[PDB]
């Protein structure tokens, strides 16, 4: 792949093999010479088939087990792409056994290798996409609840509301902390960490903004308009941040 890989895990699995395909490209096809014999690939190529067979095994269980719908539609084509790519590798080994200098077979090696890595890439991005959708779900849930601070006019409720939004924040903070460590783009990690930090420190402020309101909302005096404008401003500010976080999570090259 030309663009940097989306995450550290994907980079770890593909980057190295992608380099090899490049070396093989430079070597044989699209490079200096290529016909000087090619040992028997039957052994290793059989190993890929097995591996591929297992990957498709695991992936299919994943399909009939996940609740995500997109994952259910997106993963299956990857099995095929991979399975079909594997077919070319087997046909290539075969040809090579008949002729070590066969170029269409060499073309098949590169083609079959690319299909497997590409199809394995789609499988990991699909899976990754499904994971980010879990984080977003959490974020939108916090968004939905933040829109509830609007009511709350009693210390009792304010304490309840607090008892609920607290763990939400803690949960969103962990996911984004760990997801951030996986990004392969500096700027994206940075943007996320800042948004999350800005949100972590606005929590105590939202709670104070709320305590302020409930109090004045229970005191026959006090200028309620002010408390309102500010509590709302704090919610408007926490929301924008969280949407920024949602936006950044879906950023891909």
């Amino acid at each position: 792949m030309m663009p940097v890989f989306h995450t550290r895990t994907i980079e770890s699995i593909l980057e190295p093999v992608a380099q090899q395909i490049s070396h093989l490209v430079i070597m044989h096809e699209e490079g200096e010479v290529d016909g000087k014999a090619i040992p028997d690939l039957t052994a290793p190529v059989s190993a890929v088939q097995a591996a591929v067979s297992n990957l498709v095994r695991v992936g299919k269980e994943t399909v009939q087990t996940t609740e995500d719908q997109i994952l259910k539609r997106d993963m299956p084509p990857a099995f095929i792409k991979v399975e079909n790519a594997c077919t070319k590798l087997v046909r290539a080994a075969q040809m090579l056994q008949a002729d070590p200098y066969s170029v269409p077979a060499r073309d098949y090696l590169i083609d079959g290798s690319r299909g497997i890595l590409s199809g394995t890439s789609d499988l990991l991005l699909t899976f990754d996409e499904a994971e980010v959708r879990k984080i977003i779900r959490v974020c939108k849930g916090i968004l939905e609840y933040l829109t509830v601070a609007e009511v709350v006019e009693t210390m009792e409720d304010l304490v309840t509301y607090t008892k609920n939004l607290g763990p939400g924040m803690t949960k969103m903070a962990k996911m984004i902390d760990e997801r951030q460590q996986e990004l392969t783009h500096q700027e994206h990690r940075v943007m996320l960490v800042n948004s999350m930090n800005t949100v972590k420190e606005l929590l105590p402020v939202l709670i104070s903004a709320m305590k302020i309101f409930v109090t004045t909302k229970n005191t026959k005096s006090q200028g309620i308009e002010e408390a309102l404008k500010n509590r709302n401003f704090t919610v408007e500010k926490m929301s924008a941040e969280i949407n920024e976080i949602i936006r950044v999570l879906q950023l891909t090259s």
Partner: peptide
């Protein structure tokens, strides 16, 4: 799980081994 990610790593390492035989 991480089972999916592990089997994806094998296919990769098994393919790598294939290119390694091509001295690539």
């Amino acid at each position: 799980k991480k089972e999916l990610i592990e089997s994806a790593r094998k296919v990769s390492e098994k393919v790598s081994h294939v290119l390694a035989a091509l001295q690539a």
